[PDB]
Amino acid sequence: NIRPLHDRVIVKRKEVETKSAGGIVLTGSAAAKSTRGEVLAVGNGRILENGEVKPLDVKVGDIVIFNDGYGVKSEKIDNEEVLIMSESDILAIVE
Amino acid sequence: NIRPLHDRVIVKRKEVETKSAGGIVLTGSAAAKSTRGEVLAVGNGRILENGEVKPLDVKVGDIVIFNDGYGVKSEKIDNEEVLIMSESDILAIVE
Amino acid sequence: NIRPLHDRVIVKRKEVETKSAGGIVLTGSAAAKSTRGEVLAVGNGRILENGEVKPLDVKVGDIVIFNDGYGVKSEKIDNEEVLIMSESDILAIVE
Amino acid sequence: SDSKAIAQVGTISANSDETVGKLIAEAMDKVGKEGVITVEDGTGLQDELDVVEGMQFDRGYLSPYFINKPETGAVELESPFILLADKKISNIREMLPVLEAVAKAGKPLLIIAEDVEGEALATLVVNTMRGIVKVAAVKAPGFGDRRKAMLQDIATLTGGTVISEEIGMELEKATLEDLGQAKRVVINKDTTTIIDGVGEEAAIQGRVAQIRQQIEEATSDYDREKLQERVAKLAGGVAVIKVGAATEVEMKEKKARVEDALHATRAAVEEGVV
Amino acid sequence: VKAPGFGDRRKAMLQDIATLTGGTVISEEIGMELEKATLEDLGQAKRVVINKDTTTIIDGVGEEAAIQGRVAQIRQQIEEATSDYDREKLQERVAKLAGGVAVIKVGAATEVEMKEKKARVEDALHATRAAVEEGVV
């Protein structure tokens, strides 16, 4: 169990789909890495300039869409891959 | 169904025009990608320094003109392509 | 003893694991430097724009997750290597 | 068809040399109808016949530290797995799943790959001497399409699956089903031998049948002899005759006589005698 | 001092010195780092003399069985050697590990006399080797 700091969220990305709009399976560089993940850990909140802290909009259990970049980090917990990344890199939440 | 987070807006790009100022059809690099789109959903709003949130000026259903760049992200939802980008990239609203 | 200033924290990073999910021993560039450490010294707190200071979220004794970079510094105190870095370099707290 | 007539033909073609005929008859009897026989220079004064059974390719170990039997300087593995990697391996991160699975299995492993770089080889040699896994690594024989074909041949003989990117499989997803098995593997500085490998016969007969069809559809003699050597490796044997002579001119003259005798015995078998 | 040889023979010579001195060769290809070296990885001797050109190690501390094992190994790859150059290099190695090395300098007033006498001495040395290995008539 790990808890993020402030406005960070820990997610795990979904497995890359093989078939695409039919039975055609994609293998190699064609199957781009999925940019949809499942939130597991949510931090306490971002710190404002004046000092008080406000809760995050993303809640544990939702599905998020993010943009991969330099701010996103991958680390191994329980022999599993998770992403520790800032909330500003969250784009939208599915449903 | 996906909802934008904070000050982001989801748009779909209009099809590139082929005939321009008459019957002449444009094919190849001549037909530049359209910079007009249709908004689908609008986020709650931007977060200020002090803490409160302001609603975004762009409403759902209007036609917007934007700038392509690094801040704009393309996402494939429902086997359809949409653009994920901030409200600051919106230049003007048609009608 | 060493005490930091403001929002800096001094840690000692854990030894790199040799065996990975079994008896296979990793040697060379395969065993990447560990990104888990133990906090030893904690600063007083970050200075806000208005002037008052707020305490660190990380407490002495916990295990932290950090990102190696230019801001992280290594210092040889009392014949023991330690890491000096700001709070923003802290990603998550183990347990 | 009998061995006596083959001895007589080999004797007559070697300028009435009984020993040459007897040696060639013994070689043809031992190697089989599908085997090959070659002639090379010797080191002593007497002719000698060395016959190789099973599959051998001219690739040795990639690191002398793998040797567990310094008495002969040879790596001996009993009942190992054969991992046929049709790709260049430099990073150990790819081999972790199969190595852990084989370590759980408790029996040795052999890597036949295009090459192994410094990091993976270092990890393997470190692990071998610690007693964790018994691993030996050798190069894939040949260059180009023939290398692919001979990897496929070893897969058919050993009952395994070639791990290649061009088919759509990754080495990280390999399991024990993609690994072949054998009874003994002996590796030297120069040659690797696989002895008594497990494989259902129908696969071997089918493969040698196909190889016979591209044998019939071959133009150059070099391609035909390479294909015949492949058939010998899969099904028959390979025999080598060394010629002994005191000097070099005598060696050349005797070697030419032996080649004449070998060609004549082949022709006499394939069409008869008058 | 520098390690003798160039390439694999240099590795063999380093391993031979390790066997003679009772030490362990520190190499990356087997998996130890020189920082983690202890006193057990260091060999021992009795006396070392270094000059501008030659280094000598005298009365190294090592249990014999390693020396006989190494020289036996070397004579097995001696029997499996083709070129005379390789065979004489391995013979030099066996001589260093177990026996000795002698050098005979030929003395003559001029160069033609020196060459003639040197050829005679080489003939004599070859003949003594052959007479030892097979006998005389």
The two three-digit tokens of residue C12, written as one number: 């000692």
Best residue in A2, A9, A50 for a mutation probing chain C (most C CBs within 10 Å): A2
* Closest approach of D190 to chain E, Cα-based (Å): 12
Looking at residue D141, what DSSP letter applies?
A: P
How many residues would you count in chain C?
95
Q: What resolution in angstroms, rounded to 1 decimal?
A: 2.9
Q: Is residue D138 within 8 Å of D110, Cβ to Cβ?
A: yes
- Of C54, C5, C44, B53, the closest CA to residue A49 belongs to C54
Chain-chain contact of C91 with A50 (C-beta, under 8 angstroms): no
Considering Cα of A55, then A60, then A65, then A66, what sign does the dihedral take? positive
C-alpha distances in Å from residue D224, one per residue of B49, D56, E20: 81, 19, 54
Query: Beta B8-13 vs B80-86: how paired, if at all?
Result: antiparallel
C-alpha distances in Å from residue A59, one per residue of A42, A43, A64, E80, E101: 7, 10, 10, 73, 83
Select from D71, D72, D125 the Cβ nearest to the Cβ of E30.
Answer: D125
Q: Is residue A51 within 8 Å of A73, Cβ to Cβ?
A: no
Q: Is residue D178 within 8 Å of D102, Cβ to Cβ?
A: no
Nearest CA in chain D to C23: D132
Best residue in A16, A91, A94, A95 for a mutation probing chain B (most B CBs within 10 Å): A91
**Fold entry, domain D54-234:** GroEL (3.50.7)
CB atoms within 10 A of CB C49: 9
Round to the nearest angstrom and report the end-to-end CA distance of chain A: 27
Q: How many CA atoms lie within 13 A of E38 on its CB side?
A: 1
Q: Measured between alpha carbons, how far is D87 from D71 in angstroms, rounded to an integer?
A: 33
Round to the nearest angstrom and report the end-to-end CA distance of chain B: 27
Nearest CA in chain C to D92: C30
Best residue in D71, D128, D132, D242 for a mutation probing chain E (most E CBs within 10 Å): D71
* Non-local CB neighbours of E129 within 8 Å, separated by 6+ positions: none
* Closest approach of E9 to chain D, Cα-based (Å): 13
Q: Is residue D253 within 8 Å of D57, Cβ to Cβ?
A: no
The two three-digit tokens of residue D216, written as one number: 């019939």
Chain-chain contact of C93 with A3 (C-beta, under 8 angstroms): yes
Looking at residue E48, what DSSP letter applies?
A: E
Q: Measured between alpha carbons, how far is B71 from B86 in angstroms, rounded to an integer?
A: 7
Q: Is residue E48 within 8 Å of E20, Cβ to Cβ?
A: no
Q: Is residue D208 within 8 Å of D231, Cβ to Cβ?
A: yes
* Non-local CB neighbours of A10 within 8 Å, separated by 6+ positions: A2, A4, A39, A40, A41, A42, A82, A83, A84, A85, C92
For E16, the 3-state DSSP assignment is helix
Write out chain C residues lying below 8 Å of D132, CB-based: 23-25
How many residues would you count in chain E?
137
Query: Beta D55-57 vs D75-78: how paired, if at all?
Result: unpaired
- The CATH number of the structural domain formed by D1-53+235-272 is 3.30.260.10
**Fold entry, domain C1-95:** 10 Kd Chaperonin, Protein Cpn10; Chain O (2.30.33)
Q: Is residue A47 within 8 Å of A69, Cβ to Cβ?
A: no
- Of A29, A82, A63, A66, the closest CA to residue B75 belongs to A66
For D151, the 3-state DSSP assignment is helix
Annotate D200-237 with DSSP letters as a single string: -HHHHHHHHHHHHHHHHT--SHHHHHHHHHHHHHHTSE
Q: Measured between alpha carbons, how far is B66 from B86 in angstroms, rounded to an integer?
A: 10
Q: Measured between alpha carbons, how far is A1 from A82 in angstroms, rounded to an integer?
A: 12
Q: Measured between alpha carbons, how far is D79 from D108 in angstroms, rounded to an integer?
A: 7
Name the helix (H) or strand (E) containing E95.
helix E84-97
Name the helix (H) or strand (E) containing C39.
strand C36-42
Domain boundaries, chain D: 1-53+235-272, 54-234
Write out chain C residues lying below 8 Å of D92, CB-based: 26, 30
- Of D246, D105, D80, the closest CA to residue D160 belongs to D80
Q: Is residue B14 within 8 Å of B82, Cβ to Cβ?
A: no
Q: Which strand ranges, in their side-by-side order, compose the sheet holding C90-94?
A: A2-4, C90-94, C63-66, C36-42, C8-13, C80-86, C73-77
- Of C70, C73, C39, C69, the closest CA to residue C56 belongs to C39
What are phi and psi for residue C84, nearest 5 degrees? -115, 120
* Non-local CB neighbours of D120 within 8 Å, separated by 6+ positions: D89, D90, D91, D92, D95
Q: How far is CA E46 from the centre of its chain?
A: 19
For D264, the 3-state DSSP assignment is helix
Q: Measured between alpha carbons, how far is E66 from E22 in angstroms, rounded to an integer?
A: 9
Q: Do chains D and E meet with 3 or more Cβ pairs nearer than 8 Å?
A: yes
Residue with tokens 């001797």: E45
Q: Is C25 on the interface with D (CB under 8 A)?
A: yes
Looking at residue D180, what DSSP letter applies?
A: E
Q: Is residue C27 within 8 Å of C52, Cβ to Cβ?
A: no
Report the structure determination method.
Answer: cryo-EM
Q: Is residue E23 within 8 Å of E31, Cβ to Cβ?
A: no
The two three-digit tokens of residue E10, written as one number: 């240099």
Domain boundaries, chain B: 1-95
Nearest CA in chain E to D119: E29
CB atoms within 10 A of CB D44: 11
List the beta bridge partners of residue B76.
B81
Chain-chain contact of A5 with C95 (C-beta, under 8 angstroms): no
Write out chain E residues lying below 8 Å of D121, CB-based: 29
Write out chain D residues lying below 8 Å of C32, CB-based: none
If you count DSSP H runs as helices and E runs as strands, how many of each does chain A have, helices first? 0, 9
What are phi and psi for residue B71, nearest 5 degrees? -70, -20
Chain-chain contact of C25 with D130 (C-beta, under 8 angstroms): yes
Considering Cα of A54, then A57, then A60, then A66, what sign does the dihedral take? negative
- Of D82, D256, D248, the closest CA to residue D162 belongs to D82
List the beta bridge partners of residue B66.
B90
One-letter amino acid identity for E113? E
Q: Is D204 on the interface with C (CB under 8 A)?
A: no
